[PDB]
Amino acid sequence: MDKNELVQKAKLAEQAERYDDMAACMKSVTEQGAELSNEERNLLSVAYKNVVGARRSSWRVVSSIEQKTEGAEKKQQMAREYREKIETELRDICNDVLSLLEKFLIPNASQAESKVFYLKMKGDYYRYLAEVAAGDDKKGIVDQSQQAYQEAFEISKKEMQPTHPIRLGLALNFSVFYYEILNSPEKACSLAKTAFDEAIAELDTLSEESYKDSTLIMQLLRDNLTLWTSD
């Protein structure tokens, strides 16, 4: 199928909220091995963010039902079996994206922006794996998430303005990793506060095109700081 036909199908699938079809189209675009445009990169991100987000939401609900059915053995067992099914689907979705990131996107990224975007995304998908991981495998998944975020962060600090939407979005997601996965609220708050304060100090330099996206991400950083400092 031509690259343009697949991208047009992904856009039709997006308008129909068919994110599994969008992911299959954008996978088939990525596996052609050409560097993605900013539009194609964003379509790939939206596709797999919605597909994984749906499974994570289902997993949290079913995990809460398994916990609340304690003492009802048959109901608890049915909730467990259904949780483990969703964890398998989530693992398959994450490993699919991680394979695309490692084979086609990170190696072919020519620009610092694209590298930080894909390394942030690598950190996000290992973080989603770490949320559902149990036993000894969890440590290796956590280390991979942390490595991908640190590599993204080192590039973003050198090559990107504090007000840049992707650098802010990296600080947001990496602060959530420190909080939810590493149980390190002081590191989460320190990172989120530093990124917010640096971006406030330079906010007057921001272009009209990036203004909406950066200010929305700065708002989310502030809301997380408020939540984690009350806890």
């Binding site: 979005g169 959530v176 809301d223």
Partner: peptide, 5 residues
């Protein structure tokens, strides 16, 4: 709940 993007 806390925000990610």
């Amino acid at each position: 709940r806390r925000a990610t993007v």
